[PDB]
Amino acid sequence: SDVLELTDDNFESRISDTGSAGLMLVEFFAPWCGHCKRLAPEYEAAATRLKGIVPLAKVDCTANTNTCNKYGVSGYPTLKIFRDGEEAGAYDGPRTADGIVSHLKKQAGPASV
């Protein structure tokens, strides 16, 4: 696994590890059955594909509800973006590993692909 498994106990220290990647990506989810179980093995694969390019993380909204209601998660799976460890807005692509990598390639260097 390559996804960070952050919590309210330590999240506030790990978003500051950003610099070379410019940002951190995170998925808010829950332990209940749903599209989060179908997307988890794709989001794991994105973190392997982007390990030195875009940091990826996961957070349980049922266990970190105080962060997730302040962040306006309100449902799951819910992907968000934090430039230099501070809110840039939200993810904007397919719910697949290919979507995460494509959203990077489109700004990192789409020429000569």
Side-chain angles (χ1 to χ4, degrees):
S1 294
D2 288 289
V3 181
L4 299 175
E5 306 194 314
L6 305 183
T7 60
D8 180 65
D9 190 68
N10 88 111
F11 177 100
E12 292 284 270
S13 71
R14 303 309 184 186
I15 82 297
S16 306
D17 194 61
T18 52
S20 304
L23 70 83
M24 178 174 288
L25 217 171
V26 61
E27 182 186 271
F28 298 99
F29 79 110
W32 316 138
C33 297
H35 298 113
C36 52
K37 274 59 171 63
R38 284 65 174 266
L39 187 60
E42 285 286 290
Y43 192 74
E44 292 271 304
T48 308
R49 289 168 177 275
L50 302 174
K51 186 56 168 68
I53 315 182
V54 191
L56 261 67
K58 73 182 75 162
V59 179
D60 289 271
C61 184
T62 55
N64 308 269
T65 314
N66 61 359
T67 303
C68 296
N69 281 246
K70 186 170 62 177
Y71 282 25
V73 173
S74 305
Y76 19 83
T78 288
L79 289 88
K80 295 190 70 183
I81 296 174
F82 296 81
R83 189 177 182 173
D84 195 53
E86 295 186 274
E87 186 182 76
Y91 175 61
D92 184 35
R95 284 183 169 89
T96 61
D98 197 63
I100 321 301
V101 181
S102 300
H103 173 92
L104 182 280
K105 290 187 301 183
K106 283 172 181 289
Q107 54 183 302
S112 304
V113 177

XYZ file of all heavy atoms in Angstrom:
846
model
N 0.836 -1.229 0.000
C 0.000 0.000 0.000
C 0.858 1.262 0.000
O 1.931 1.299 0.601
C -0.944 0.029 1.208
O -1.897 -1.016 1.099
N 0.368 2.320 -0.663
C 1.078 3.607 -0.824
C 0.268 4.835 -0.352
O 0.801 5.942 -0.303
C 1.492 3.756 -2.298
C 2.643 2.808 -2.672
O 3.790 3.037 -2.218
O 2.404 1.834 -3.423
N -1.007 4.643 0.015
C -1.908 5.688 0.543
C -1.650 5.905 2.041
O -1.588 4.940 2.810
C -3.381 5.278 0.330
C -4.369 6.332 0.848
C -3.715 5.070 -1.152
N -1.513 7.161 2.468
C -1.404 7.542 3.882
C -2.737 7.332 4.618
O -3.786 7.768 4.153
C -1.001 9.025 3.964
C 0.355 9.386 3.328
C 0.551 10.902 3.374
C 1.524 8.721 4.050
N -2.729 6.714 5.798
C -3.954 6.348 6.535
C -4.153 7.271 7.752
O -4.049 6.872 8.920
C -3.976 4.840 6.851
C -3.784 3.987 5.585
C -4.139 2.501 5.788
O -3.721 1.899 6.806
O -4.819 1.913 4.910
N -4.351 8.557 7.438
C -4.374 9.676 8.384
C -5.585 9.660 9.342
O -6.642 9.092 9.045
C -4.330 10.996 7.588
C -3.148 11.147 6.611
C -3.190 12.521 5.945
C -1.807 11.012 7.327
N -5.437 10.352 10.482
C -6.439 10.461 11.563
C -6.350 11.824 12.249
O -5.303 12.467 12.216
C -6.213 9.402 12.657
O -4.938 9.539 13.247
C -6.316 7.972 12.146
N -7.396 12.239 12.965
C -7.416 13.461 13.791
C -6.262 13.546 14.821
O -5.870 14.640 15.232
C -8.790 13.537 14.481
C -8.949 14.769 15.385
O -8.946 15.909 14.862
O -9.124 14.598 16.618
N -5.688 12.401 15.212
C -4.523 12.316 16.099
C -3.212 12.831 15.464
O -2.333 13.299 16.194
C -4.342 10.858 16.547
C -3.302 10.720 17.673
O -3.566 11.187 18.808
O -2.229 10.109 17.440
N -3.066 12.754 14.129
C -1.797 13.090 13.446
C -1.894 13.823 12.086
O -0.883 14.352 11.629
C -0.919 11.821 13.363
C -1.148 10.936 12.146
O -0.302 10.827 11.269
N -2.269 10.254 12.044
N -3.067 13.907 11.453
C -3.290 14.569 10.153
C -2.646 15.962 10.083
O -1.912 16.258 9.146
C -4.810 14.636 9.895
C -5.260 15.361 8.632
C -5.616 14.635 7.479
C -5.380 16.767 8.623
C -6.044 15.302 6.319
C -5.822 17.435 7.468
C -6.142 16.700 6.315
N -2.808 16.766 11.141
C -2.315 18.150 11.266
C -0.782 18.314 11.190
O -0.278 19.437 11.113
C -2.828 18.740 12.598
C -4.345 18.954 12.646
C -4.766 20.190 11.825
O -4.805 21.311 12.393
O -5.066 20.052 10.614
N -0.038 17.203 11.189
C 1.426 17.162 11.048
C 1.912 16.658 9.683
O 3.038 16.958 9.280
C 2.001 16.265 12.151
O 1.685 14.903 11.900
N 1.079 15.888 8.965
C 1.477 15.163 7.744
C 1.252 15.971 6.474
O 2.019 15.837 5.524
C 0.694 13.844 7.650
C 0.857 12.908 8.858
C 2.306 12.634 9.269
N 2.337 11.662 10.376
C 3.400 11.274 11.058
N 4.598 11.724 10.802
N 3.273 10.405 12.022
N 0.263 16.863 6.470
C -0.020 17.764 5.332
C 1.124 18.760 5.063
O 1.302 19.244 3.945
C -1.393 18.457 5.483
C -1.427 19.717 6.381
C -2.451 17.435 5.922
C -1.069 19.483 7.850
N 1.942 19.004 6.089
C 3.149 19.842 6.057
C 4.362 19.142 5.426
O 5.375 19.792 5.175
C 3.524 20.277 7.483
O 2.425 20.901 8.141
N 4.274 17.836 5.135
C 5.326 17.084 4.428
C 5.361 17.371 2.909
O 6.282 16.956 2.202
C 5.142 15.586 4.704
C 6.366 14.748 4.294
O 7.469 14.982 4.841
O 6.221 13.809 3.472
N 4.362 18.111 2.407
C 4.283 18.630 1.038
C 5.435 19.598 0.720
O 5.963 20.301 1.591
C 2.936 19.337 0.772
O 2.624 20.310 1.747
C 1.770 18.359 0.737
N 5.813 19.645 -0.562
C 6.808 20.590 -1.088
C 7.152 20.338 -2.560
O 6.756 21.112 -3.431
N 7.823 19.221 -2.852
C 8.238 18.834 -4.217
C 7.050 18.504 -5.135
O 7.077 18.809 -6.328
C 9.174 17.619 -4.169
O 10.305 17.860 -3.346
N 5.995 17.903 -4.571
C 4.741 17.597 -5.267
C 3.791 18.809 -5.406
O 2.838 18.770 -6.185
C 4.055 16.485 -4.473
N 4.025 19.874 -4.627
C 3.217 21.101 -4.569
C 1.924 20.982 -3.746
O 1.437 21.995 -3.242
N 1.370 19.777 -3.571
C 0.086 19.521 -2.906
C -0.028 18.102 -2.322
O 0.816 17.244 -2.579
C -1.057 19.823 -3.917
C -1.213 18.852 -5.115
C -2.018 17.594 -4.770
C -1.950 19.577 -6.239
N -1.115 17.860 -1.581
C -1.559 16.539 -1.107
C -3.020 16.313 -1.533
O -3.846 17.231 -1.485
C -1.386 16.449 0.419
C -1.880 15.115 1.000
S -1.549 14.866 2.768
C 0.247 14.608 2.753
N -3.330 15.085 -1.940
C -4.671 14.611 -2.293
C -5.182 13.705 -1.154
O -4.401 12.975 -0.539
C -4.568 13.869 -3.646
C -5.751 14.038 -4.613
C -5.387 13.432 -5.969
C -7.043 13.355 -4.163
N -6.483 13.735 -0.872
C -7.109 12.913 0.176
C -8.489 12.424 -0.259
O -9.212 13.128 -0.965
C -7.168 13.686 1.513
C -7.987 14.972 1.428
C -7.689 12.842 2.684
N -8.864 11.222 0.175
C -10.185 10.623 -0.001
C -10.864 10.441 1.363
O -10.404 9.679 2.215
C -10.050 9.275 -0.729
C -11.414 8.622 -0.975
C -11.236 7.215 -1.579
O -11.164 7.097 -2.823
O -11.198 6.223 -0.810
N -11.982 11.134 1.562
C -12.857 10.924 2.707
C -13.872 9.820 2.386
O -14.495 9.829 1.319
C -13.527 12.249 3.082
C -12.528 13.314 3.491
C -12.118 14.302 2.575
C -11.970 13.278 4.781
C -11.151 15.247 2.954
C -10.996 14.220 5.154
C -10.577 15.198 4.235
N -14.021 8.861 3.303
C -14.825 7.645 3.122
C -15.433 7.133 4.444
O -15.294 7.782 5.476
C -13.971 6.573 2.410
C -12.975 5.819 3.276
C -13.185 4.455 3.568
C -11.834 6.468 3.788
C -12.267 3.755 4.369
C -10.928 5.771 4.611
C -11.137 4.409 4.892
N -16.123 5.989 4.433
C -16.683 5.343 5.628
C -16.524 3.797 5.536
O -16.374 3.271 4.427
C -18.165 5.744 5.697
N -16.585 3.052 6.661
C -16.440 1.592 6.687
C -17.670 0.818 6.176
O -17.568 -0.389 5.936
C -16.154 1.249 8.153
C -16.876 2.350 8.929
C -16.703 3.566 8.021
N -18.817 1.477 5.994
C -20.055 0.886 5.468
C -19.929 0.519 3.977
O -19.144 1.120 3.241
C -21.209 1.879 5.677
C -21.286 2.552 7.018
C -21.561 3.864 7.197
C -21.082 2.000 8.368
N -21.536 4.166 8.546
C -21.232 3.061 9.313
C -20.768 0.723 8.889
C -21.072 2.874 10.697
C -20.609 0.523 10.278
C -20.761 1.591 11.180
N -20.712 -0.464 3.521
C -20.743 -0.901 2.116
C -21.170 0.236 1.163
O -22.117 0.980 1.448
C -21.677 -2.115 1.985
S -21.022 -3.510 2.946
N -20.490 0.360 0.018
C -20.732 1.400 -0.987
C -19.599 1.529 -2.006
O -18.650 0.743 -2.009
N -19.672 2.553 -2.861
C -18.669 2.848 -3.895
C -17.244 3.067 -3.356
O -16.275 2.837 -4.075
C -19.130 4.060 -4.720
C -20.437 3.829 -5.448
N -21.633 4.461 -5.194
C -20.658 2.952 -6.475
C -22.552 3.977 -6.043
N -22.005 3.042 -6.846
N -17.093 3.444 -2.082
C -15.795 3.512 -1.399
C -15.026 2.172 -1.410
O -13.814 2.171 -1.627
C -15.997 4.048 0.027
S -17.271 3.103 0.912
N -15.710 1.023 -1.259
C -15.088 -0.320 -1.338
C -14.612 -0.668 -2.759
O -13.581 -1.322 -2.931
C -16.071 -1.393 -0.822
C -16.032 -1.615 0.700
C -16.350 -0.363 1.529
C -16.513 -0.671 3.021
N -15.270 -1.200 3.650
N -15.347 -0.202 -3.773
C -15.040 -0.407 -5.204
C -13.897 0.505 -5.680
O -13.090 0.094 -6.516
C -16.304 -0.175 -6.058
C -17.326 -1.326 -6.014
C -17.965 -1.575 -4.638
N -19.028 -2.602 -4.709
C -20.325 -2.415 -4.872
N -20.852 -1.236 -5.056
N -21.142 -3.430 -4.853
N -13.811 1.721 -5.131
C -12.791 2.725 -5.448
C -11.478 2.556 -4.663
O -10.419 2.919 -5.177
C -13.399 4.114 -5.203
C -12.508 5.286 -5.648
C -12.190 5.248 -7.139
C -13.249 6.593 -5.380
N -11.496 1.969 -3.462
C -10.295 1.760 -2.646
C -9.119 1.086 -3.399
O -8.031 1.667 -3.403
C -10.666 1.012 -1.360
N -9.288 -0.053 -4.110
C -8.184 -0.701 -4.829
C -7.687 0.109 -6.039
O -6.540 -0.057 -6.456
C -8.716 -2.073 -5.250
C -10.227 -1.855 -5.347
C -10.494 -0.859 -4.225
N -8.507 1.013 -6.578
C -8.083 1.962 -7.617
C -7.290 3.138 -7.020
O -6.263 3.544 -7.560
C -9.322 2.495 -8.353
C -9.952 1.506 -9.333
C -9.109 1.365 -10.608
O -9.071 2.336 -11.403
O -8.495 0.292 -10.823
N -7.718 3.673 -5.875
C -7.027 4.779 -5.214
C -5.660 4.353 -4.637
O -4.679 5.097 -4.695
C -7.954 5.345 -4.131
C -7.500 6.673 -3.561
C -7.638 7.846 -4.326
C -6.939 6.735 -2.270
C -7.234 9.086 -3.795
C -6.536 7.970 -1.734
C -6.699 9.149 -2.488
O -6.339 10.348 -1.954
N -5.550 3.110 -4.158
C -4.278 2.461 -3.787
C -3.305 2.422 -4.970
O -2.145 2.814 -4.851
C -4.537 1.014 -3.332
C -5.307 0.900 -2.017
C -4.406 0.881 -0.772
O -3.499 0.017 -0.678
O -4.628 1.703 0.149
N -3.806 1.988 -6.130
C -3.037 1.904 -7.373
C -2.570 3.286 -7.873
O -1.422 3.429 -8.297
C -3.857 1.162 -8.439
N -3.406 4.325 -7.751
C -3.019 5.708 -8.032
C -1.859 6.181 -7.142
O -0.935 6.825 -7.633
C -4.241 6.608 -7.856
N -1.872 5.846 -5.848
C -0.808 6.224 -4.925
C 0.526 5.530 -5.256
O 1.574 6.153 -5.126
C -1.267 5.939 -3.495
N 0.499 4.285 -5.752
C 1.681 3.597 -6.311
C 2.185 4.288 -7.586
O 3.389 4.528 -7.721
C 1.362 2.120 -6.623
O 0.805 1.467 -5.503
C 2.606 1.315 -7.006
N 1.277 4.650 -8.507
C 1.593 5.310 -9.791
C 2.116 6.751 -9.649
O 2.815 7.233 -10.541
C 0.344 5.280 -10.691
C 0.048 3.859 -11.191
C -1.340 3.780 -11.832
N -1.602 2.437 -12.385
C -1.256 1.973 -13.576
N -0.609 2.694 -14.448
N -1.564 0.754 -13.920
N 1.810 7.413 -8.531
C 2.122 8.824 -8.249
C 2.989 8.998 -6.985
O 3.078 10.101 -6.453
C 0.796 9.619 -8.137
C -0.135 9.579 -9.363
C -1.455 10.287 -9.054
C 0.493 10.254 -10.578
N 3.659 7.949 -6.489
C 4.357 7.928 -5.184
C 5.417 9.020 -4.976
O 5.606 9.489 -3.853
C 4.929 6.512 -4.976
C 5.563 6.249 -3.596
C 4.614 6.530 -2.420
C 5.156 6.000 -1.083
N 6.357 6.745 -0.620
N 6.064 9.461 -6.055
C 7.033 10.569 -6.078
C 6.538 11.797 -6.853
O 7.354 12.601 -7.308
N 5.214 11.920 -7.032
C 4.562 12.903 -7.916
C 3.392 13.617 -7.216
O 3.303 14.841 -7.283
C 4.087 12.212 -9.223
C 5.151 11.267 -9.842
C 3.667 13.269 -10.261
C 4.751 10.586 -11.157
N 2.517 12.873 -6.523
C 1.336 13.370 -5.784
C 1.061 12.470 -4.555
O 0.602 11.336 -4.722
C 0.057 13.418 -6.661
C -1.050 14.186 -5.927
C 0.249 14.107 -8.016
N 1.364 12.919 -3.321
C 0.934 12.245 -2.092
C -0.591 12.056 -2.038
O -1.342 13.014 -2.249
C 1.424 13.130 -0.942
C 2.603 13.884 -1.543
C 2.202 14.059 -3.007
N -1.042 10.843 -1.703
C -2.453 10.447 -1.575
C -2.720 9.922 -0.149
O -1.847 9.282 0.452
C -2.792 9.374 -2.632
C -3.493 9.883 -3.907
C -2.631 10.779 -4.789
C -3.921 8.692 -4.759
N -3.928 10.145 0.373
C -4.320 9.793 1.741
C -5.798 9.374 1.864
O -6.624 9.744 1.034
C -4.035 10.987 2.654
N -6.160 8.672 2.942
C -7.543 8.259 3.252
C -7.918 8.615 4.698
O -7.073 8.527 5.589
C -7.733 6.765 2.932
C -7.047 5.822 3.939
C -7.186 4.332 3.615
C -6.276 3.915 2.453
N -6.071 2.445 2.419
N -9.180 9.000 4.919
C -9.720 9.410 6.230
C -11.177 8.947 6.387
O -12.038 9.290 5.575
C -9.643 10.945 6.406
C -10.221 11.396 7.757
C -8.212 11.487 6.342
N -11.465 8.184 7.444
C -12.824 7.749 7.806
C -13.677 8.917 8.347
O -13.460 9.373 9.472
C -12.756 6.636 8.864
C -12.223 5.308 8.309
O -13.040 4.493 7.812
O -11.000 5.053 8.428
N -14.680 9.384 7.603
C -15.677 10.374 8.038
C -16.500 9.949 9.275
O -16.886 10.797 10.084
C -16.585 10.678 6.833
S -17.836 11.963 7.094
N -16.728 8.646 9.478
C -17.375 8.112 10.696
C -16.491 8.188 11.947
O -17.024 8.227 13.059
C -17.788 6.647 10.520
O -16.663 5.890 10.137
C -18.858 6.468 9.445
N -15.162 8.238 11.775
C -14.187 8.316 12.876
C -13.501 9.695 13.031
O -12.852 9.945 14.048
C -13.157 7.195 12.693
N -13.665 10.601 12.055
C -13.046 11.936 12.000
C -14.043 13.015 11.530
O -13.783 13.891 10.709
C -11.829 11.922 11.098
C -10.805 10.843 11.415
O -9.867 11.037 12.177
N -10.948 9.675 10.833
N -15.235 12.869 12.063
C -16.483 13.563 11.686
C -16.345 15.071 11.847
O -16.828 15.839 11.014
C -17.665 13.033 12.524
O -17.645 11.621 12.564
C -19.031 13.443 11.983
N -15.607 15.484 12.875
C -15.271 16.869 13.198
C -14.464 17.590 12.110
O -14.739 18.751 11.793
C -14.555 16.818 14.563
C -13.256 16.008 14.651
O -12.768 15.390 13.714
N -12.676 15.948 15.825
N -13.519 16.884 11.484
C -12.778 17.365 10.316
C -13.695 17.376 9.091
O -13.771 18.369 8.374
C -11.544 16.477 10.054
O -10.718 16.442 11.202
C -10.676 16.981 8.900
N -14.455 16.300 8.875
C -15.220 16.090 7.646
C -16.452 17.003 7.508
O -16.808 17.372 6.389
C -15.584 14.609 7.565
S -14.124 13.548 7.409
N -17.077 17.423 8.617
C -18.199 18.378 8.583
C -17.708 19.824 8.414
O -18.329 20.607 7.690
C -19.065 18.218 9.845
C -19.989 17.019 9.741
O -21.206 17.134 9.692
N -19.437 15.832 9.660
N -16.545 20.157 8.996
C -15.834 21.424 8.740
C -15.355 21.521 7.280
O -15.292 22.613 6.719
C -14.676 21.557 9.750
C -13.950 22.912 9.678
C -12.977 23.132 10.845
C -11.851 22.086 10.877
N -10.886 22.366 11.976
N -15.057 20.370 6.661
C -14.548 20.259 5.277
C -15.672 20.101 4.233
O -15.417 20.131 3.027
C -13.558 19.086 5.192
C -12.150 19.342 5.724
C -11.883 20.319 6.705
C -11.091 18.564 5.221
C -10.568 20.531 7.162
C -9.771 18.773 5.673
C -9.502 19.758 6.643
O -8.228 19.965 7.077
N -16.913 19.939 4.700
C -18.122 19.827 3.876
C -18.217 18.525 3.066
O -18.751 18.532 1.954
N -17.668 17.417 3.585
C -17.632 16.096 2.916
C -19.046 15.584 2.608
O -19.346 15.285 1.451
C -16.820 15.085 3.758
C -16.877 13.650 3.232
C -15.346 15.503 3.806
N -19.921 15.539 3.622
C -21.380 15.285 3.544
C -21.851 14.017 2.787
O -23.048 13.862 2.526
C -22.094 16.538 3.021
O -21.774 17.675 3.823
N -20.946 13.101 2.436
C -21.157 11.902 1.636
C -19.800 11.384 1.149
O -18.778 12.054 1.293
N -19.771 10.176 0.590
C -18.524 9.478 0.232
C -18.691 8.450 -0.915
O -19.811 7.978 -1.156
C -17.898 8.828 1.487
C -18.803 8.613 2.687
C -19.635 7.478 2.752
C -18.842 9.575 3.718
C -20.538 7.322 3.823
C -19.732 9.415 4.794
C -20.590 8.297 4.849
O -21.460 8.155 5.881
N -17.587 8.069 -1.610
C -16.224 8.600 -1.465
C -16.091 10.033 -2.013
O -16.646 10.363 -3.067
C -15.316 7.635 -2.240
C -16.241 7.045 -3.301
C -17.615 7.027 -2.626
N -15.329 10.871 -1.308
C -15.211 12.319 -1.549
C -13.738 12.732 -1.562
O -13.074 12.723 -0.527
C -16.017 13.106 -0.508
O -17.385 12.929 -0.801
C -15.770 14.618 -0.537
N -13.220 13.067 -2.748
C -11.804 13.390 -2.958
C -11.538 14.910 -2.964
O -12.248 15.670 -3.634
C -11.315 12.740 -4.267
C -11.180 11.202 -4.222
C -12.474 10.467 -4.592
C -10.123 10.743 -5.225
N -10.494 15.363 -2.255
C -10.107 16.783 -2.091
C -8.592 17.019 -2.216
O -7.793 16.088 -2.151
C -10.644 17.336 -0.753
C -12.182 17.388 -0.685
C -12.704 18.156 0.543
C -12.421 19.664 0.432
N -12.864 20.404 1.642
N -8.217 18.284 -2.428
C -6.867 18.749 -2.786
C -6.424 19.881 -1.855
O -7.166 20.839 -1.626
C -6.837 19.220 -4.260
C -7.120 18.028 -5.191
C -5.483 19.846 -4.640
C -7.262 18.421 -6.667
N -5.176 19.790 -1.393
C -4.562 20.705 -0.423
C -3.156 21.139 -0.873
O -2.163 20.463 -0.604
C -4.539 20.073 0.976
C -5.913 19.817 1.560
C -6.648 18.675 1.184
C -6.481 20.747 2.446
C -7.955 18.489 1.666
C -7.790 20.564 2.925
C -8.533 19.442 2.520
N -3.080 22.256 -1.601
C -1.830 22.887 -2.065
C -1.001 23.385 -0.874
O -1.502 24.127 -0.029
C -2.155 24.015 -3.067
C -0.881 24.555 -3.735
C -1.217 25.628 -4.779
N 0.009 26.118 -5.444
C 0.075 26.944 -6.473
N -0.986 27.450 -7.041
N 1.235 27.291 -6.958
N 0.257 22.961 -0.799
C 1.178 23.209 0.326
C 0.573 22.893 1.723
O 0.925 23.515 2.730
C 1.741 24.636 0.184
C 2.977 24.905 1.067
O 3.952 24.120 1.006
O 3.009 25.946 1.771
N -0.377 21.949 1.789
C -1.072 21.548 3.018
C -2.264 22.439 3.423
O -2.666 22.425 4.589
N -2.841 23.200 2.489
C -3.988 24.097 2.697
C -4.968 23.992 1.512
O -4.548 23.808 0.369
C -3.523 25.556 2.856
C -2.682 25.801 4.115
C -2.376 27.299 4.291
O -1.384 27.803 3.706
O -3.125 27.995 5.022
N -6.277 24.076 1.775
C -7.335 23.775 0.792
C -7.172 24.531 -0.543
O -7.159 25.767 -0.573
C -8.715 24.040 1.414
C -9.863 23.600 0.494
C -11.229 23.930 1.126
O -11.630 25.120 1.120
O -11.916 23.004 1.626
N -7.114 23.785 -1.654
C -7.180 24.334 -3.009
C -8.610 24.229 -3.569
O -9.086 25.146 -4.242
C -6.177 23.576 -3.881
N -9.307 23.130 -3.248
C -10.742 22.975 -3.497
C -11.183 21.515 -3.429
O -11.472 20.994 -2.353
N -11.202 20.854 -4.585
C -11.708 19.488 -4.762
C -11.119 18.808 -6.017
O -10.709 19.480 -6.967
C -13.240 19.550 -4.858
N -11.113 17.470 -6.025
C -10.790 16.673 -7.212
C -11.843 16.849 -8.330
O -13.024 17.092 -8.056
C -10.656 15.204 -6.790
C -10.447 14.210 -7.920
C -9.315 14.313 -8.759
C -11.400 13.197 -8.142
C -9.160 13.419 -9.835
C -11.228 12.282 -9.196
C -10.116 12.405 -10.058
O -9.968 11.541 -11.091
N -11.424 16.722 -9.596
C -12.257 16.966 -10.781
C -11.902 16.005 -11.934
O -11.238 16.370 -12.909
C -12.169 18.454 -11.192
C -13.091 18.800 -12.374
O -14.202 18.225 -12.483
O -12.727 19.676 -13.195
N -12.319 14.743 -11.794
C -12.132 13.684 -12.794
C -12.884 12.380 -12.460
O -13.618 12.323 -11.469
N -12.732 11.326 -13.286
C -13.306 9.999 -13.031
C -12.901 9.401 -11.667
O -11.766 9.575 -11.210
C -12.794 9.108 -14.171
C -12.491 10.093 -15.299
C -12.019 11.337 -14.556
N -13.809 8.637 -11.047
C -13.525 7.807 -9.855
C -12.821 6.502 -10.260
O -13.406 5.418 -10.215
C -14.806 7.582 -9.028
C -15.211 8.822 -8.216
C -16.442 8.519 -7.347
N -16.707 9.586 -6.358
C -17.447 10.670 -6.512
N -17.978 11.000 -7.657
N -17.682 11.446 -5.494
N -11.569 6.637 -10.694
C -10.644 5.565 -11.106
C -9.192 6.005 -10.886
O -8.910 7.206 -10.871
C -10.784 5.221 -12.605
O -10.488 6.329 -13.423
C -12.166 4.711 -13.016
N -8.259 5.050 -10.779
C -6.818 5.321 -10.738
C -6.340 6.162 -11.931
O -5.576 7.113 -11.780
C -6.076 3.976 -10.727
N -6.839 5.826 -13.126
C -6.527 6.506 -14.385
C -6.936 7.979 -14.367
O -6.235 8.824 -14.912
C -7.282 5.810 -15.517
C -6.714 6.174 -16.899
O -5.535 5.849 -17.174
O -7.456 6.751 -17.729
N -8.054 8.276 -13.706
C -8.550 9.628 -13.478
C -7.565 10.473 -12.664
O -7.226 11.585 -13.079
N -7.032 9.926 -11.559
C -6.061 10.632 -10.701
C -4.762 10.939 -11.466
O -4.276 12.072 -11.458
C -5.694 9.826 -9.430
C -6.850 9.055 -8.758
C -5.032 10.772 -8.417
C -8.044 9.892 -8.296
N -4.222 9.931 -12.165
C -3.009 10.061 -12.987
C -3.238 11.034 -14.146
O -2.414 11.915 -14.372
C -2.541 8.681 -13.486
C -1.254 8.769 -14.324
C -2.239 7.735 -12.314
N -4.374 10.944 -14.846
C -4.722 11.870 -15.943
C -4.828 13.327 -15.478
O -4.294 14.225 -16.135
C -6.033 11.473 -16.635
O -5.923 10.177 -17.183
N -5.458 13.574 -14.324
C -5.573 14.896 -13.714
C -4.196 15.507 -13.388
O -4.031 16.728 -13.472
C -6.467 14.750 -12.472
C -6.560 15.977 -11.609
N -7.496 16.988 -11.671
C -5.706 16.278 -10.589
C -7.200 17.884 -10.710
N -6.112 17.494 -10.019
N -3.190 14.682 -13.065
C -1.791 15.101 -12.947
C -1.147 15.348 -14.329
O -0.607 16.427 -14.563
C -1.031 14.053 -12.099
C 0.460 14.316 -11.803
C 1.379 13.954 -12.970
C 0.720 15.755 -11.350
N -1.202 14.386 -15.264
C -0.520 14.492 -16.579
C -0.910 15.747 -17.366
O -0.057 16.387 -17.975
C -0.798 13.252 -17.446
C -0.086 12.009 -16.906
C -0.211 10.791 -17.837
C -1.668 10.368 -18.096
N -1.739 9.139 -18.933
N -2.194 16.117 -17.291
C -2.807 17.300 -17.928
C -2.185 18.651 -17.538
O -2.371 19.631 -18.263
C -4.321 17.306 -17.645
C -5.061 16.293 -18.534
C -6.530 16.176 -18.111
C -7.291 15.147 -18.964
N -7.522 15.621 -20.360
N -1.445 18.714 -16.431
C -0.782 19.919 -15.919
C 0.740 19.759 -15.774
O 1.488 20.716 -15.996
C -1.435 20.317 -14.589
C -1.491 19.233 -13.500
C -2.216 19.691 -12.237
O -1.851 20.665 -11.591
N -3.264 18.997 -11.835
N 1.203 18.551 -15.455
C 2.628 18.214 -15.344
C 3.380 18.209 -16.695
O 4.555 18.601 -16.743
C 2.742 16.851 -14.660
N 2.735 17.766 -17.787
C 3.387 17.643 -19.098
C 2.599 16.815 -20.124
O 3.013 15.696 -20.440
N 1.457 17.319 -20.642
C 0.624 16.599 -21.615
C 1.242 16.525 -23.028
O 0.793 15.723 -23.856
C -0.708 17.357 -21.621
C -0.300 18.796 -21.295
C 0.863 18.613 -20.323
N 2.253 17.349 -23.328
C 2.969 17.354 -24.601
C 3.834 16.086 -24.797
O 4.399 15.536 -23.846
C 3.827 18.625 -24.660
N 3.969 15.659 -26.055
C 4.753 14.493 -26.520
C 4.380 13.121 -25.912
O 5.091 12.134 -26.133
C 6.263 14.765 -26.399
O 6.631 15.936 -27.114
N 3.263 13.027 -25.166
C 2.685 11.771 -24.629
C 2.235 10.830 -25.755
O 1.475 11.276 -26.646
C 1.532 12.074 -23.655
C 0.865 10.800 -23.127
C 2.048 12.849 -22.435
